[PDB]
Design a protein around this motif. Structure first.
Motif, PDB file in Angstrom:
ATOM      1  N   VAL A 156     -20.152 -53.114  20.600  1.00  0.00           N
ATOM      2  CA  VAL A 156     -19.826 -54.189  19.671  1.00  0.00           C
ATOM      3  C   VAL A 156     -19.887 -53.683  18.234  1.00  0.00           C
ATOM      4  N   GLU A 157     -20.988 -53.043  17.857  1.00  0.00           N
ATOM      5  CA  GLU A 157     -21.131 -52.508  16.501  1.00  0.00           C
ATOM      6  C   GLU A 157     -20.848 -51.010  16.483  1.00  0.00           C
ATOM      7  N   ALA A 158     -19.612 -50.668  16.832  1.00  0.00           N
ATOM      8  CA  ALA A 158     -19.106 -49.312  16.693  1.00  0.00           C
ATOM      9  C   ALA A 158     -17.628 -49.403  16.364  1.00  0.00           C
ATOM     10  N   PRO A 159     -17.063 -48.401  15.692  1.00  0.00           N
ATOM     11  CA  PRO A 159     -15.645 -48.486  15.327  1.00  0.00           C
ATOM     12  C   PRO A 159     -14.743 -48.443  16.545  1.00  0.00           C
ATOM     13  N   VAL A 160     -13.433 -48.561  16.330  1.00  0.00           N
ATOM     14  CA  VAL A 160     -12.491 -48.411  17.435  1.00  0.00           C
ATOM     15  C   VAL A 160     -12.689 -47.060  18.096  1.00  0.00           C
ATOM     16  N   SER A 161     -12.880 -46.026  17.285  1.00  0.00           N
ATOM     17  CA  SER A 161     -12.969 -44.681  17.830  1.00  0.00           C
ATOM     18  C   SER A 161     -14.216 -44.519  18.684  1.00  0.00           C
ATOM     19  N   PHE A 166     -23.036 -39.673  15.303  1.00  0.00           N
ATOM     20  CA  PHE A 166     -22.314 -39.593  14.038  1.00  0.00           C
ATOM     21  C   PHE A 166     -21.161 -40.582  14.022  1.00  0.00           C
ATOM     22  N   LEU A 167     -20.401 -40.628  15.113  1.00  0.00           N
ATOM     23  CA  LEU A 167     -19.151 -41.375  15.123  1.00  0.00           C
ATOM     24  C   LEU A 167     -19.394 -42.867  14.916  1.00  0.00           C
ATOM     25  N   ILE A 168     -20.428 -43.420  15.553  1.00  0.00           N
ATOM     26  CA  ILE A 168     -20.780 -44.813  15.305  1.00  0.00           C
ATOM     27  C   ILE A 168     -21.336 -44.976  13.899  1.00  0.00           C
ATOM     28  N   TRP A 228     -19.200 -44.448  10.592  1.00  0.00           N
ATOM     29  CA  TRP A 228     -18.053 -45.326  10.417  1.00  0.00           C
ATOM     30  C   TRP A 228     -18.271 -46.681  11.074  1.00  0.00           C
ATOM     31  N   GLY A 229     -19.516 -47.115  11.187  1.00  0.00           N
ATOM     32  CA  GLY A 229     -19.794 -48.438  11.698  1.00  0.00           C
ATOM     33  C   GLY A 229     -19.462 -49.523  10.692  1.00  0.00           C
ATOM     34  N   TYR A 230     -19.489 -50.766  11.170  1.00  0.00           N
ATOM     35  CA  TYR A 230     -19.217 -51.934  10.341  1.00  0.00           C
ATOM     36  C   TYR A 230     -20.362 -52.928  10.317  1.00  0.00           C
ATOM     37  N   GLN A 231     -20.911 -53.274  11.459  1.00  0.00           N
ATOM     38  CA  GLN A 231     -21.932 -54.305  11.470  1.00  0.00           C
ATOM     39  C   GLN A 231     -23.264 -53.736  10.989  1.00  0.00           C
ATOM     40  N   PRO A 232     -24.108 -54.551  10.354  1.00  0.00           N
ATOM     41  CA  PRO A 232     -25.468 -54.078  10.060  1.00  0.00           C
ATOM     42  C   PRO A 232     -26.248 -53.722  11.308  1.00  0.00           C
ATOM     43  N   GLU A 233     -25.883 -54.287  12.460  1.00  0.00           N
ATOM     44  CA  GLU A 233     -26.557 -53.953  13.708  1.00  0.00           C
ATOM     45  C   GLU A 233     -26.405 -52.481  14.057  1.00  0.00           C
ATOM     46  N   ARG A 234     -25.423 -51.805  13.459  1.00  0.00           N
ATOM     47  CA  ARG A 234     -25.153 -50.387  13.672  1.00  0.00           C
ATOM     48  C   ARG A 234     -26.437 -49.569  13.730  1.00  0.00           C
TER      49      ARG A 234
END
Ligand SMILES: CCCCCCCCCCCCCCCCCC(=O)OC[C@H](COP(=O)([O-])OCC(O)COP(=O)([O-])OC[C@@H](COC(=O)CCCCCCCCCCCCCCCCC)OC(=O)CCCCCCCCCCCCCCCCC)OC(=O)CCCCCCCCCCCCCCCCC
Ligand SMILES: CCCCCCCCCCCCCCCCCC(=O)OC[C@H](COP(=O)(O)OCCN)OC(=O)CCCCCCCCCCCCCCCCC
Lengths: 84, 446, 112, 144, 108, 48, 151, 85, 59, 48, 134
Positions: free
Chosen positions: B209-214, B125-127, B130-136
């Motif tokens: 790389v493709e996950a938020p700071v958290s 869930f956490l990635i 609230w992910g950013y990259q399309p690689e998420r």
């Protein structure tokens, strides 16, 4: 004004300290030297004196005071009572 | 420990109640303070609640988990800025927190494995939420299936152990010893993926790389450690079989260490550097652990703890750049000493801890692990030297190039350093200096 | 009077730090014995390092008294140094004379 | 766009693709030269740089980003690092060749080392006697 | 000089110099203050290739020999050496040749 | 300027006694001096 | 007080010792309550030899005894080391004066400590230690002194 | 100390009056190198090289070709050192 | 950078006090050098004579 | 700079071992200790 | 402003060669009395063969370049306050918007500056609007 600049009338390639001699030792090649006028203010009298004089000024800067203060100390150890 | 558990459950409602991001945060730190107070344990299992215990090994791991789990909320505030379902974020975090506590305190192997693999969901869930990259997307596929593809198979080993043993409390296994040559690989390798191992490092750079700071802070701060904590508990009875087949694991870890360090030198992404760096350090931890010597094990416990802390702080740094200059690249990020000089202090310090500069609980680790490995086999020294050498090497490059060169021309005005981030960096490092005073609790668990 | 001739005659030149090897011949020098002044018990308390705990130690402890007496200006403690190094110098004379003595006692039997 | 939006295409295999790729990377039709794409290649990514060094590039040229001596849109070399001034690179051709630098160093080191060990066999000294030590049963003889 | 290769590059390549200036000096998106950077194709190209080149990887003799001698032979040889030396040392140990005096690392 | 003097009088309780050949103790001065000769001569050069 | 600065260093030693010892006698003695704290005496336990095949509580009791005993004997090596440490510091000439007479106690201690506890690694409980002794006794009786190979 | 635009001018003038191979009288301050100074292909860079040593910086290799006059030299020194003001 | 920057000239003639500072700095060096020289000139020489091996008669 | 020139002299002479300065107290005592102790050819010749 | 083309004429390949040579004299000869001698001796070597065929010019570069490269001082007189200097580029300064983000109390130290800073900013906006008509 930061500083001042002369007119360059004074800057004579006829600077005496063997700049004429290298002019001669060039003259045997006999080509020219157009910039040599720059080296006039460079090797100018009373700017830095002779290299041997400069070395005298440096390698002996306070020898006279040293010997004088030395002789005073010699007199002190001679008469103060240290004796020998 | 049910005190902690019930506290977390009664914290869960705050996620629903509006504007409780900061109230939740203070509570999580406050309970961490309470859990700090509760400390008297010995090697034996202690605080034996219905099925929850606690020990040297579990006590520090839990404290780090509560510690890091509270520091999430300091790290991530863009969720509040965006109003990106803060309620789901807070609920996800607390759910994760409870699972970690129950994983580290499960006195049964099966209870331990149950919560261990239950944590697969909330992290995902956490990635993903609230992910950013399309690689998420593909990253989540890597994370989940690398884990489940081996994490499921130990389920057989657990039940096989039951049949031959009659229970799964840790002390009960220790009394016995198994050498069927599949039990060993099935449990070992299954933990090795989450460790992770250099040959199965593959997923981990992608996940970070493709996950938020958290999420990245969680991934590098517990998940890798949680794999190791299981190892410490389980290898008690894998000894003979381990002795026969151990040179392979220590070899690939040590060999992979110098390689992954050279990958770090050539790498060009802040999270990629740290991600590979974290794999390198956990390579040495895996080595000392598989030595199984007293020095190795007691040092492994320390290095897991210290490594988790340093890796988190470095991720906060990576978040800072990502949140100012909006790009993870080495190239774009540069010369930040001119824009946040008081921050570059913290950049240096966290870098320092990762290269084992004292007073640093990390460093305390490598003395223990390096002593163990050297005793185990003199041959190791020829690669141990290079492993640490290149360890510090890329950290130097990371610190310098990011903070030193002349600024980047195209950079649009971004706010300056702020109390939240400053306090966040102190909080991850300063305990990393504190602990050395009382390493005995974090140093002795066997 | 050098050391290179050793490589040509590694026998003839005695070598370094070499103990006497013909001292039984008392027709020449070395008929009397050593003499001990500073007792090893006082030397022990003197804390004189073993590298120097040798026959020239009585003056050594004497100097230590000088320096522990008027330490702030050791330069005053000159004559105690002067004597001590002289007593050592005489030992060095014996060191040389021992070297050539065993050289002499070597040579008189070399060709024989 | 995102990275998957920018993913380089496969190596161009006919002249039209060469024209397209050179434009994809803003390169002139001859400027563009894809890697060998033999089994460890990036494909259509152009093969630039790889010279002696980045600092060999113009010192005073007007650079958009002087940091790396780089103008605006331009394909960054696949090995920008490993040739950057902060990494392996110089500004001028070397004076000699690799064997020279290593040979001049190590050849001297081996010879001087070996010649030392030969001379250690003949360790000179001052011809003085063995250092005397008081001890039980020791009776060195005074020259008296 | 190729007859104007340098020139032909010159025309277009000097145009975007000004657009870089326009972007950099842009008072408006600099006023927004959201951070970020003027887009740069070489950077975007570089990141994408850096993250993705497997779709290009052809498993041929080159790559195989490259990888084989890159880690594989290193891993195998080093592991074999470690096991071999340990087998010898442990063999002495279980034979009891070296008693509890000589041996080293008595304390790990 | 005072230099080692303060240490030299307060570090060596047992000053090393060195009675060497004159051609060695003094040699330390002249093998030293020839360097300065070369240092101030090889620098001093006539034009041609 | 022959030496001048030593006759002065004493003066600062009087300066430093003054207030502290005054403080000790002034605001400690009139403000201290008397209380006593003793030192454990753990009863012995039926060791692994005594306990039965499956007596988990008993086995757990034996290991805890083994651990505490390990921690002490673990220590006795340290104290002997500290003891030897002092001697080597005793006097600059004084190394061979009492190194071997004192160190060898530490030497024997190490070897004995190794034999009992050494070579087991972490997780080692009373069982593995106890049976190792059994194995060593068998080896000594069959193949002779360890350090001879086999026959 | 700072640098004064007038003194930069007199200083380039001083060296120019100093340089022999130029027309000795130092004709109009805006004397083009190939026109009345007659400065050859190589004499031009001798001018630049002295200017370098005098003003403490290299001039760029091509940018010397931009310098086609003593007015240019002042103009190039001025752009460097913030002399306009 | 510095409050004195001349142009194509020697240093701007500085005060006698600074001149005095330098001369004394060299003078102190010399004073002590001759001070030690006369006080222990023998030190440069080997402090002890060097007796000869041949000159040592065979008792 | 007659002060800096003079001071640079003092550093030179201390480093150059001009008598009764830092180098003379230190460089000297070392070099004859090399003489006193038996040593190797290169080590000897190289110091001087 | 104009960024120059990279094309080069044989005159420049020969004159900048003379420039580098003069530099290489410096790095190998220092004393200005010695220098001007050898620099003008160098000129004769660039003068005796003043005008030759293009082909000979190419061989002349084939020798000239080698002389520089094979006779380059191992420590060239790199220039002090220019690119490659021993202390050049010592520090950098960031873009002005950093000053824009001072805390209002931080702003409250130089109001006259910041007031004029505000004015110049709007006038720059007008200037940039002009720069290409926006
Ligand atoms: C802890 C802490 O941060 O307390 C605040 C404070 C650090 O902030 P600061 O002293 O105000 O920094 C100077 C100015 O703020 C001005 O600081 P600045 O903005 O000019 O930045 C200077 C420096 C800020 O740091 C420093 O200037 C050095 C001070 C130690 C950090 O940070 C940088 O930007 C340079 C990069 C960092 C290099 C790493 C230097 C630390 C090496 C640690 C070796 C141990 O630490 C102290 O209270 C005492 C520091 C004295 C050293 C004792 C060791 C602690
Ligand atoms: C012998 C002991 C030598 C110690 C130096 C080890 C080599 C690495 C190093 O840091 O040296 C400096 C090196 C080059 O840096 P530098 O030449 O000064 O400037 C960049 C030029 N393009 O710096 C680097 O280029 C960084 C290279 C990364 C570290 C690689 C080290 C390899 C170790 C042996 C293989």
């Amino acid at each position: 004004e930061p500083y001042t600049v002369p007119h360059a009338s004074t800057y004579k390639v006829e600077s005496v300290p063997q700049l004429v001699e290298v002019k001669e030792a060039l003259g045997r090649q006999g080509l020219k030297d157009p910039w040599l006028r720059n080296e006039v203010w460079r090797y100018e009298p009373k700017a830095f004196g002779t290299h041997r004089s400069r070395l005298n000024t440096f390698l002996f800067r306070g020898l006279g005071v040293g010997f004088c203060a030395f002789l005073a100390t010699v007199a002190v150890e001679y008469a103060l009572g240290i004796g020998k | 420990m049910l005190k902690i558990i019930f506290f977390l459950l009664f914290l869960i409602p705050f996620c629903f109640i509006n504007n409780m991001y900061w109230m939740v945060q203070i509570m999580m730190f406050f309970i961490s303070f309470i859990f700090l107070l509760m400390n008297n344990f010995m090697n034996y299992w202690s605080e034996i609640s219905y099925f929850l215990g606690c020990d040297m090994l579990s006590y520090g791991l839990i404290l780090l988990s509560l510690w890091i789990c509270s520091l999430m909320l300091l790290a991530s505030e863009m969720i509040n800025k965006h109003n990106n379902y803060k309620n789901l974020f807070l609920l996800n975090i607390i759910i994760l927190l409870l699972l970690l506590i129950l994983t580290f305190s499960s006195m049964s192997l099966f209870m331990f494995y149950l919560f261990f693999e239950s944590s697969l969901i909330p992290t995902l869930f956490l990635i993903l939420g609230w992910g950013y990259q399309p690689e998420r997307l593909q990253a989540g596929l890597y994370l989940l299936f690398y884990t489940l593809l081996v994490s499921l198979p130990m389920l057989i080993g657990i039940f096989y152990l039951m049949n031959k043993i009659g229970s799964m409390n840790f002390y009960l296994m220790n009394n016995f010893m198994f050498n069927y040559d599949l039990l060993y690989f099935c449990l070992l390798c299954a933990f090795l993926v989450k460790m992770p191992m250099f040959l199965v490092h593959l997923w981990l750079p992608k996940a970070h790389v493709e996950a938020p700071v958290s999420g990245s802070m969680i991934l590098a701060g517990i998940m890798l450690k949680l794999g190791g904590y299981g190892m410490l508990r389980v290898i008690s009875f894998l000894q003979l079989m381990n002795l026969k087949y151990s040179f392979v694991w220590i070899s690939i870890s040590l060999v992979g260490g110098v390689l992954v360090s050279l990958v770090c030198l050539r790498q060009t992404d802040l999270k990629a550097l740290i991600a590979y760096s974290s794999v390198a350090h956990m390579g040495i931890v895996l080595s000392g652990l598989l030595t199984m010597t007293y020095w190795g094990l007691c040092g492994s416990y320390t290095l897991m703890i210290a490594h988790g802390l340093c890796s988190s702080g470095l991720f906060c740094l990576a978040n800072v750049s990502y949140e100012r200059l909006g790009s993870r690249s080495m190239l774009i990020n540069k010369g930040l000493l001119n824009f946040m000089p008081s921050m570059t202090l913290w950049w240096f310090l966290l870098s320092s801890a990762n290269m084992a500069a004292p007073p640093t609980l990390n460093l305390l680790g490598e003395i223990y692990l390096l002593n163990s490995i050297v005793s185990w086999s003199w041959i190791s020294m020829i690669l141990l030297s290079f492993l640490s050498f290149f360890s510090a090497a890329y950290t130097l490059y990371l610190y310098s190039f990011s903070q030193h060169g002349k600024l980047f021309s195209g950079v649009y005005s971004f706010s300056s350093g702020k109390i939240r981030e400053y306090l966040l960096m102190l909080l991850h490092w300063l305990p990393l200096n504190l602990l050395i005073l009382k390493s005995e609790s974090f140093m002795l668990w066997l | 009077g050098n050391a290179l001739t050793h490589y040509m005659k590694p026998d003839v030149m005695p070598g370094p730090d070499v103990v006497p090897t013909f001292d039984p011949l008392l027709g020449f020098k070395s008929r009397k014995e050593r003499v001990m002044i500073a007792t090893q018990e006082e030397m022990e308390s003197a804390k004189l390092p073993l590298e120097f705990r040798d026959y020239c130690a009585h003056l050594a402890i004497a100097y230590q008294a000088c320096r522990s007496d008027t330490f702030p200006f050791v330069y005053k403690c000159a004559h105690q140094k002067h004597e001590y190094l002289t007593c050592e110098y005489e030992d060095y004379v014996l060191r040389m004379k021992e070297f050539e003595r065993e050289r002499r006692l070597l040579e008189r039997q070399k060709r024989l | 766009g995102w990275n998957k939006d920018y993913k380089p295409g496969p190596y161009p295999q006919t002249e039209k693709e060469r024209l397209a790729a050179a434009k994809k990377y803003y390169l002139l039709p001859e400027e563009y030269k894809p890697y060998a794409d033999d089994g460890l290649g990036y494909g259509d990514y152009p093969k630039l740089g790889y010279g002696l060094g980045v600092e060999a590039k113009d010192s005073y040229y007007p650079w958009d980003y002087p940091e790396h001596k780089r103008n605006q849109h331009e394909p960054i070399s696949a090995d920008h690092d490993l040739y950057s001034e902060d990494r392996w690179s110089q500004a001028e051709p070397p004076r000699y060749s690799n064997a020279y630098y290593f040979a001049c160093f190590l050849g001297v080191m081996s010879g001087c080392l070996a010649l030392y060990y030969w001379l250690d066999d003949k360790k000179m000294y001052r011809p003085v006697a063995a250092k005397q030590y008081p001890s039980p049963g020791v009776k060195h003889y005074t020259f008296e | 000089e190729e007859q104007e290769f340098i020139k032909r590059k010159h025309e277009a390549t000097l145009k975007l110099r000004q657009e870089f200036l326009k972007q950099s000096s842009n008072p408006y998106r600099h006023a927004t203050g959201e951070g970020g950077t003027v887009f740069d194709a070489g950077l975007a190209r570089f990141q994408a290739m850096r993250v993705s080149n497997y779709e290009h990887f052809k498993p041929t003799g080159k790559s195989f020999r490259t990888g084989l001698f890159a880690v594989v032979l290193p891993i195998a040889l080093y592991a074999w050496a470690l096991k071999a030396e340990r087998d010898g040392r442990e063999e002495k140990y279980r034979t009891g040749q070296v008693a509890y005096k000589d041996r080293q690392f008595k304390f790990i | 300027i005072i230099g080692g003097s303060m240490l030299n009088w307060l570090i060596f309780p047992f000053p090393y006694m060195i009675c060497l050949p004159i051609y060695m103790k003094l040699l330390t001065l002249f093998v030293c001096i020839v360097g300065g000769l070369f240092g101030y001569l090889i620098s001093l050069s006539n034009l041609f | 007080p022959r030496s001048p600065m030593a006759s002065f260093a004493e003066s600062v030693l009087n300066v430093i010792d003054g207030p502290i010892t005054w403080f000790r006698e002034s605001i400690v003695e009139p403000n201290q309550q008397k209380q006593n704290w003793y030192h454990q005496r753990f009863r012995r336990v039926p060791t692994i030899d005594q306990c039965y095949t499956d007596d988990a509580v008993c086995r757990f009791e034996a290991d805890q005894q083994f651990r505490r005993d390990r921690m002490v004997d673990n220590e006795i090596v340290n104290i002997l080391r500290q003891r030897f440490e002092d001697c080597t510091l005793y006097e600059a000439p004084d190394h061979m004066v009492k190194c071997r007479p004192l160190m060898d106690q530490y030497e024997k201690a190490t070897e004995n400590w190794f034999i009992k506890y050494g070579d087991l690694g972490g997780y080692a409980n009373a069982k593995t230690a106890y049976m190792k002794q059994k194995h060593r006794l068998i080896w000594e009786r069959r193949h002779g002194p360890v350090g001879s190979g086999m026959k | 100390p700072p640098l004064s635009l007038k003194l930069i001018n007199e200083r380039v003038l001083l060296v120019l009056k100093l340089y022999d191979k130029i027309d000795p009288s130092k004709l109009n301050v805006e004397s083009h190198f190939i026109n009345d100074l007659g400065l050859d292909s190589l004499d031009h860079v001798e001018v630049i090289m002295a200017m370098e040593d005098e003003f403490g910086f290299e001039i760029p290799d091509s940018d010397a070709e931009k310098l086609l006059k003593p007015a240019d030299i002042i103009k190039y020194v001025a752009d460097k050192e913030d002399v306009y003001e | 950078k510095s409050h004195v920057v001349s142009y194509r000239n020697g240093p701007p003639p500085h005060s006698k006090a600074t001149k005095i500072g330098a001369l004394t700095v060299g003078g102190a060096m010399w004073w002590w050098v001759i001070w030690h020289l006369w006080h222990e000139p023998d030190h440069i020489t080997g402090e002890f004579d060097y007796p000869n091996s041949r000159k040592w008669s065979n008792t | 700079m007659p002060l800096t020139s003079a001071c640079f002299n003092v550093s030179n002479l201390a480093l150059c071992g001009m008598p009764f300065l830092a180098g003379f107290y230190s460089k000297d005592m070392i070099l004859e200790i090399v003489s006193i102790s038996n040593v190797n050819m290169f080590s000897f010749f190289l110091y001087y | 402003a104009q960024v120059p083309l990279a094309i080069v004429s044989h005159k420049r390949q020969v004159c900048s060669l003379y420039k580098r040579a003069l530099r290489n004299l410096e790095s190998w000869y220092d004393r200005r009395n010695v220098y001007r001698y050898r620099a003008v001796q160098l000129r004769a070597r660039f003068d005796e063969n003043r005008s030759k065929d293009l082909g000979e010019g190419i061989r002349l570069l084939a020798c000239g370049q080698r002389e520089l490269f094979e006779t380059r001082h191992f420590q060239p007189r790199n220039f002090a306050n220019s690119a490659g200097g021993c202390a050049f580029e010592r520090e950098v300064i960031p873009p002005d918007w950093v000053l824009d983000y001072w805390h209002p109390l931080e702003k409250a130290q130089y109001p006259e500056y910041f007031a004029k800073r505000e004015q110049r900013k709007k006038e720059f906006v007008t200037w940039w609007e002009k720069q290409y008509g926006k």
